[PDB]
Design a protein around this motif. Structure first.
Motif, PDB file in Angstrom:
ATOM      1  N   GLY A  12       0.813  -1.197   0.000  1.00 56.44           N
ATOM      2  CA  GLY A  12       0.000   0.000   0.000  1.00 56.44           C
ATOM      3  C   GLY A  12       0.850   1.251   0.000  1.00 56.44           C
ATOM      4  O   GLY A  12       0.559   2.214  -0.714  1.00 56.44           O
ATOM      5  N   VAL A  13       1.930   1.248   0.777  1.00 59.69           N
ATOM      6  CA  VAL A  13       2.807   2.402   0.758  1.00 59.69           C
ATOM      7  C   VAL A  13       3.499   2.527  -0.603  1.00 59.69           C
ATOM      8  O   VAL A  13       3.479   3.601  -1.217  1.00 59.69           O
ATOM      9  CB  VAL A  13       3.799   2.346   1.925  1.00 59.69           C
ATOM     10  CG1 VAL A  13       4.833   3.484   1.795  1.00 59.69           C
ATOM     11  CG2 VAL A  13       3.036   2.439   3.237  1.00 59.69           C
ATOM     12  N   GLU A  15       2.566   1.578  -3.505  1.00 63.08           N
ATOM     13  CA  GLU A  15       1.609   2.045  -4.510  1.00 63.08           C
ATOM     14  C   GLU A  15       1.416   3.557  -4.440  1.00 63.08           C
ATOM     15  O   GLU A  15       1.249   4.217  -5.475  1.00 63.08           O
ATOM     16  CB  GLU A  15       0.274   1.324  -4.347  1.00 63.08           C
ATOM     17  CG  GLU A  15       0.238  -0.070  -4.978  1.00 63.08           C
ATOM     18  CD  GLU A  15      -1.031  -0.858  -4.629  1.00 63.08           C
ATOM     19  OE1 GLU A  15      -1.960  -0.266  -4.015  1.00 63.08           O
ATOM     20  OE2 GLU A  15      -1.085  -2.071  -4.965  1.00 63.08           O
ATOM     21  N   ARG A  16       1.455   4.131  -3.232  1.00 63.57           N
ATOM     22  CA  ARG A  16       1.345   5.585  -3.106  1.00 63.57           C
ATOM     23  C   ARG A  16       2.642   6.278  -3.516  1.00 63.57           C
ATOM     24  O   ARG A  16       2.602   7.308  -4.204  1.00 63.57           O
ATOM     25  CB  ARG A  16       0.938   5.982  -1.675  1.00 63.57           C
ATOM     26  CG  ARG A  16       0.720   7.507  -1.454  1.00 63.57           C
ATOM     27  CD  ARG A  16      -0.253   8.103  -2.498  1.00 63.57           C
ATOM     28  NE  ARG A  16      -0.534   9.530  -2.311  1.00 63.57           N
ATOM     29  CZ  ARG A  16      -1.190  10.286  -3.196  1.00 63.57           C
ATOM     30  NH1 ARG A  16      -1.611   9.753  -4.331  1.00 63.57           N
ATOM     31  NH2 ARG A  16      -1.415  11.575  -2.959  1.00 63.57           N
ATOM     32  N   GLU A  19       2.557   6.475  -7.151  1.00 67.66           N
ATOM     33  CA  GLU A  19       1.615   7.497  -7.603  1.00 67.66           C
ATOM     34  C   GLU A  19       2.226   8.892  -7.510  1.00 67.66           C
ATOM     35  O   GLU A  19       2.108   9.695  -8.443  1.00 67.66           O
ATOM     36  CB  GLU A  19       0.314   7.435  -6.794  1.00 67.66           C
ATOM     37  CG  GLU A  19      -0.633   6.260  -7.090  1.00 67.66           C
ATOM     38  CD  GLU A  19      -1.910   6.296  -6.238  1.00 67.66           C
ATOM     39  OE1 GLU A  19      -2.013   7.196  -5.382  1.00 67.66           O
ATOM     40  OE2 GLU A  19      -2.817   5.445  -6.432  1.00 67.66           O
ATOM     41  N   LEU A  20       2.866   9.206  -6.379  1.00 68.66           N
ATOM     42  CA  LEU A  20       3.440  10.539  -6.174  1.00 68.66           C
ATOM     43  C   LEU A  20       4.567  10.817  -7.147  1.00 68.66           C
ATOM     44  O   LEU A  20       4.694  11.940  -7.653  1.00 68.66           O
ATOM     45  CB  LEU A  20       3.934  10.684  -4.736  1.00 68.66           C
ATOM     46  CG  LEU A  20       2.806  10.671  -3.688  1.00 68.66           C
ATOM     47  CD1 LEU A  20       3.368  10.394  -2.332  1.00 68.66           C
ATOM     48  CD2 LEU A  20       2.089  12.024  -3.651  1.00 68.66           C
ATOM     49  N   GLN A 834       5.235  16.904  -4.285  1.00 67.73           N
ATOM     50  CA  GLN A 834       4.801  15.501  -4.264  1.00 67.73           C
ATOM     51  C   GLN A 834       5.972  14.547  -4.041  1.00 67.73           C
ATOM     52  O   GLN A 834       5.890  13.632  -3.214  1.00 67.73           O
ATOM     53  CB  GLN A 834       4.039  15.160  -5.540  1.00 67.73           C
ATOM     54  CG  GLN A 834       2.850  16.026  -5.697  1.00 67.73           C
ATOM     55  CD  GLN A 834       1.816  15.714  -4.631  1.00 67.73           C
ATOM     56  OE1 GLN A 834       1.049  14.786  -4.790  1.00 67.73           O
ATOM     57  NE2 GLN A 834       1.817  16.466  -3.524  1.00 67.73           N
ATOM     58  N   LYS A 837       6.630  14.565  -0.502  1.00 68.59           N
ATOM     59  CA  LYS A 837       5.678  13.779   0.278  1.00 68.59           C
ATOM     60  C   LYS A 837       5.955  12.290   0.128  1.00 68.59           C
ATOM     61  O   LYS A 837       5.803  11.522   1.087  1.00 68.59           O
ATOM     62  CB  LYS A 837       4.250  14.112  -0.154  1.00 68.59           C
ATOM     63  CG  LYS A 837       3.808  15.556   0.207  1.00 68.59           C
ATOM     64  CD  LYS A 837       2.297  15.741   0.311  1.00 68.59           C
ATOM     65  CE  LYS A 837       1.921  17.180   0.594  1.00 68.59           C
ATOM     66  NZ  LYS A 837       0.435  17.256   0.685  1.00 68.59           N
ATOM     67  N   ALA A 838       6.378  11.864  -1.064  1.00 63.48           N
ATOM     68  CA  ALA A 838       6.785  10.475  -1.251  1.00 63.48           C
ATOM     69  C   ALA A 838       7.902  10.095  -0.294  1.00 63.48           C
ATOM     70  O   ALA A 838       7.920   8.980   0.230  1.00 63.48           O
ATOM     71  CB  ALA A 838       7.197  10.216  -2.702  1.00 63.48           C
ATOM     72  N   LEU A 841       6.783   9.811   3.443  1.00 65.65           N
ATOM     73  CA  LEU A 841       5.937   8.650   3.713  1.00 65.65           C
ATOM     74  C   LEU A 841       6.762   7.390   3.955  1.00 65.65           C
ATOM     75  O   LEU A 841       6.535   6.666   4.932  1.00 65.65           O
ATOM     76  CB  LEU A 841       4.993   8.450   2.529  1.00 65.65           C
ATOM     77  CG  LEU A 841       4.047   7.253   2.401  1.00 65.65           C
ATOM     78  CD1 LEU A 841       3.024   7.337   3.487  1.00 65.65           C
ATOM     79  CD2 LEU A 841       3.370   7.248   1.035  1.00 65.65           C
TER      80      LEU A 841
END
Length: 849
Positions: A12-13, A15-16, A19-20, A834, A837-838, A841
């Motif tokens: 899940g992480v 995948e984000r 995306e970023l 972004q 933010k990646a 995270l």
DNA sequence: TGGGGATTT
């Protein structure tokens, strides 16, 4: 190879993160970029041209002012507030040579004035040239800059010269030091500054068009800055023929500077002190007859000497000189007996004790405070005993400088700090142990060590003069004359001990593009192998490219009054919204810790630091927590109470605060921050995200890494990335601690005294090292996939997390490159944010639960 | 379980 812990991230992480990163990759005013290309395009000839036109302020004179000041000068020399100030100035030796000095400057570009303390060269020479130009009707053309090695000296000299001219400070005499300046008027002025101020100013004025006279003082101390400045004068002086330079020195290999400037004229001005008698180890034991009881090559040195003096000294005395422990400070009760001796005989005056370090100063202090002998208890209540050490508060209080209570004698137990840095005026007796400490880097083993060493001939000379201020004194040197002959002339020029990254980078801003060629032209050339080591560090942090040329990031780093590593760290903190803590770490690592180390209190010091670190296991976050605490205490009017309780220097802290702002304003001016405040909310959204801070700290201290493999106070089996076994230094907040959430640490300084210690450390996590480091590859070595850092630490990692972290590192490198070329703050809702933010995270997966 | 000493438009 051994596989470290797993750093695979949840799907899940990842995948984000994917995306970023894809958002970052769908993005399409730089004055800075054109400056950077303009610096690379010009050769030195053109740079010299360009700089002349751009700094022309001195091509302009004010004749209405020239005349106005010429009149007021003659007028105020007939008043009776001055002309007492002149008649007392005329008792100073330097003033007897004023006219030869004026003419010597007229006929030569470079002169040297050599004189002993008391000669008044520092206060009187600048006034001699200034008052000359004013009377000749040139006042507005005359701007005199006089350097000093020490901040405190630059000020007091300024206040004094300002006194001798019946002026409040800031009309014709001023001072400028880092983050504190009482600036003198623009023209017809004398400014005292720390040598480093002048170095940072060279970037803006590379050929010294903004001054008419440069006076370098105390160059005999061979500070890096004076030696560095002199090499630069050889590059500048052929292009500034109207500039006048005056070098100034004590009588400490003065000939080296006269030789260096090719045979230039040299004045010798006599000093004004009281005579101080020098006694050596034979003479001291002769008076006190102390008895010792509780390789050699002691004997190779001592017996040939004992033979030459057989008829001048008793035979029982000469036997003690055979004892290896008679010389230096091996037997402290020997020095204690030498103090008790002076307290009885040798009438009144204060005793100044030179000991190498903190450890030996403690020993003598406890003996003078808690004597075990009858003689010591007799004297205990009649001494006022002050320890003097850069880590001790006694220097920052007014007690040690004033005269002692009635019936008590003042005894100062000091390091070399009292040689030049600190001055006690009522010293009559100097006990010179001959031992000091020095930090030595061995280029072959990459080991910095702190060793007890002998002092040099220059040192002993300086400690003697410390007794000739009030009345004629005595200096007791606890070594034989056979020792002095084997002692060096001067200390090693410190430039041969210093890391060169800063200079090599700063030279590029002066269009001195070959550090090997330029540095060879210094008085003492540094080891070319140490030059190369500096260039690789600069290429490793990507401030120079593989061809050695300055990079856009490199130009930014060079402009910052801090080492390029910590400069990069500060820069990263601007891009990652943790400006405030990170600039605390940078400011503290550059300047010093705010923490005292008072005698006896070493257990209570450990407890204060445990509490300030807040279990964060990082020495650097600990100081930032302290500053956050200090600010709160200023908010509550408990400032003093708070500092008393936690052994804090308010002076150190306030200056750390001032440095944080200097970094913030510079980052603001360079277009990396929206606001010049290091506390602004925008610059600090991540400042509470502790895993994030550790990532930026590691980006600063990388590649200085350590790995801990032992659990037990606790004992540690820990080794740095080069393989050598180390421990946490006892002053560090990780010494003896157990239960770390991570086994990897970054450090600024590693140093051997009794073992290889990390003086300072921050626990970091593998994923942050991997993201901001180098030597990163993914593969298989067991039947396990790995992800490594520095090609040294190999971690378990699945192929999905690796391919992402590698792709992440690419886009991070692509961003850093762009921000350096086109500096602009990261907008809160942009493409660039972004990628940020990646990274936040992935780093939070390590957060404490 | 231990800390020579400066300093930066």
């Amino acid at each position: 190879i051994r596989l470290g812990c797993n750093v695979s991230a949840p799907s899940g992480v990842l995948e984000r993160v994917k995306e970023l990163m894809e958002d970052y990759s769908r993005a399409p005013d730089a004055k800075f970029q054109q400056q950077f290309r303009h610096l690379l395009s010009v050769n030195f000839e053109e740079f010299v041209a360009e700089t002349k036109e751009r700094n022309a302020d001195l091509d302009w004179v004010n004749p209405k002012l020239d005349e106005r000041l010429q009149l007021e000068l003659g007028q105020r020399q007939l008043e009776e507030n001055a002309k007492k100030r002149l008649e007392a100035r005329k008792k100073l030796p330097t003033m007897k040579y004023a006219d030869d000095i004026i003419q010597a400057v007229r006929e030569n570009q470079v002169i040297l004035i050599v004189g002993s303390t008391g000669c008044g060269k520092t206060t009187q020479v600048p006034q001699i040239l200034l008052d000359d130009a004013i009377s000749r009707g040139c006042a507005s053309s005359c701007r005199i800059i006089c350097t000093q090695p020490r901040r405190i000296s630059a000020i007091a000299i300024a206040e004094w010269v300002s006194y001798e001219r019946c002026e409040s400070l800031g009309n014709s005499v001023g001072y400028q030091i880092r983050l504190e300046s009482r600036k003198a008027r623009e023209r017809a002025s004398i400014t005292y500054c720390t040598t480093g101020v002048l170095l940072q100013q060279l970037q803006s004025d590379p050929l010294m068009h903004n001054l008419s006279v440069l006076i370098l003082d105390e160059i005999h101390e061979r500070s890096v800055e004076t030696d560095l400045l002199m090499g630069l004068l050889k590059v500048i002086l052929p292009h500034r023929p109207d500039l006048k330079v005056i070098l100034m020195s004590a009588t400490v290999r003065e000939q080296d500077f006269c030789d260096y400037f090719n045979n230039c004229p040299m004045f010798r001005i006599e000093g004004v002190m009281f005579p101080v008698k020098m006694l050596y180890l034979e003479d001291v034991l002769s008076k006190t007859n102390y008895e010792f009881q509780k390789r050699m090559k002691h004997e190779a040195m001592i017996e040939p000497y004992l033979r030459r003096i057989r008829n001048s000294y008793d035979s029982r005395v000469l036997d003690k000189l055979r004892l290896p422990e008679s010389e230096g400070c091996e037997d402290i009760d020997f020095i204690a007996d030498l103090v008790y001796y002076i307290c009885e005989n040798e009438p009144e005056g204060a005793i100044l004790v030179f000991l190498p370090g903190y450890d030996k100063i403690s020993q003598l202090y406890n003996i003078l405070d808690k004597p075990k002998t009858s003689k010591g208890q007799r004297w205990r209540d009649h001494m006022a005993v002050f320890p003097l050490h850069s880590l001790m508060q006694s220097g920052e209080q007014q007690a040690v400088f004033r005269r002692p209570p009635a019936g008590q004698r003042k005894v100062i137990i000091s390091t070399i700090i009292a040689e030049t840095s600190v001055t006690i005026d009522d010293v009559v007796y100097v006990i010179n142990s001959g031992r000091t400490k020095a930090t030595n880097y061995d280029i072959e083993t990459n080991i910095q060590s702190l060793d007890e060493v002998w002092v040099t001939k220059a040192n002993t000379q300086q400690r003697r003069g410390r007794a000739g201020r009030v009345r004629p004194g005595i200096c007791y040197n606890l070594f034989s004359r056979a020792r002095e002959d084997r002692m060096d002339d001067i200390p090693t020029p410190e430039i041969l001990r210093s890391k060169l990254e800063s200079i090599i980078l700063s030279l590029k801003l002066l269009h001195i593009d070959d550090p090997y060629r330029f540095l060879q032209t210094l008085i003492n050339a540094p080891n070319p192998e140490a030059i190369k080591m500096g260039v690789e560090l600069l290429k490793r942090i990507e401030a120079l490219d593989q061809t050695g040329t300055l990079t856009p990031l490199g130009m930014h780093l060079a402009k910052l009054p801090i080492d390029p590593q910590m400069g990069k760290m500060i820069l990263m903190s601007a891009l990652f919204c943790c400006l405030d803590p990170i600039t605390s770490a940078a400011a503290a690592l550059s300047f010093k810790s705010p923490f005292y180390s008072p005698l006896g209190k070493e257990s209570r010091v450990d407890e204060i630091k445990r509490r300030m670190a807040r279990n964060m296991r990082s020495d650097h976050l600990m100081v930032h927590n302290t500053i956050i605490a200090y600010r709160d205490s200023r908010y509550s009017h408990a400032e003093r109470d708070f500092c008393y309780k936690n052994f804090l220097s308010s002076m150190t802290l306030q200056q750390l605060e001032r440095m944080k702002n200097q970094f913030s304003e510079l980052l603001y001016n360079y277009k990396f921050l929206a606001s010049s405040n290091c506390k602004d909310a925008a610059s600090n959204k991540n400042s509470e995200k502790i895993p994030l801070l550790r990532a930026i700290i590691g980006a600063g201290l990388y590649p200085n890494m350590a790995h801990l493999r032992k659990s037990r106070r606790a004992i540690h089996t820990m080794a740095t990335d080069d393989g050598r076994r180390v421990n946490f230094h006892p002053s560090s907040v990780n010494s003896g601690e157990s239960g770390f959430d991570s086994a990897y640490f970054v450090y600024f300084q590693r140093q051997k005294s009794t073992d290889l210690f990390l003086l300072d450390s921050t626990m970091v996590f593998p994923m942050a090292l991997i993201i901001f480091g180098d030597g990163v590859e993914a593969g298989v070595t067991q039947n396990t996939p790995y992800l490594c850092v520095a090609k040294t630490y190999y971690f378990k990692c699945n192929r999905e997390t690796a391919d992402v972290v590698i792709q992440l590192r690419s886009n991070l490198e692509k961003l850093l490159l762009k921000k350096a070329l086109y500096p602009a703050p990261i907008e809160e809702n942009g493409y660039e944010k972004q990628l940020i933010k990646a990274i936040e995270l992935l780093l939070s997966l390590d957060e404490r639960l």
